[PDB]
Design a protein around this ligand. Sequence first.
Ligand code: HEM
Length: 148
Amino acid sequence: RPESELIRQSWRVVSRSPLEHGTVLFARLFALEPSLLPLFQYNGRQFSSPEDSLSSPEFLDHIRKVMLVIDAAVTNVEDLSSLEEYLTSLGRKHRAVGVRLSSFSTVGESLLYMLEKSLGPDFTPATRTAWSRLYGAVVQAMSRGWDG
Ligand code: HEM
């Protein structure tokens, strides 16, 4: 795919600083859907406010993990048979921690938000569309984990 290069080129900008950019993604996510905050239960404690998650090493590690999985998707943008089974398993894991599959739409919007804000004018409509397609494919693989 040649929309694979829009993804690779737009990801290089953000992939150099995964935590900063993933923080934008999660800040956006909780602004859009505050009910996701309690799903991050580290040491059986709930974050009261979004900003509390940003002081949590475990939550920031989760942002790193998310950026690593997105980086794997970018690396395999032509692929996604390398990752199908891993994503399913990642879906099952999220289902288990209580994430509703529908929340991954908000995540998608957060990721697109974050890429728009990082790329400015370089986040063309084509780049947007490419990412929506890639993210959609990632979620489709993960959705198998909600065993449907
Ligand atoms: C609504 C959005 C999400 C929520 C509420 C969420 C929540 C969680 C929680 C609570 C865990 C277990 C604790 C931890 O490892 O920190 C987890 C694991 C993980 N999440 Fe997320 N997550 C979300 C989205 C994502 C997305 C979109 C990705 C990937 C692009 C992702 C990648 C990971 C990874 C890599 C793990 C470790 C899975 C394992 O090996 O056990 N998460 N998530």
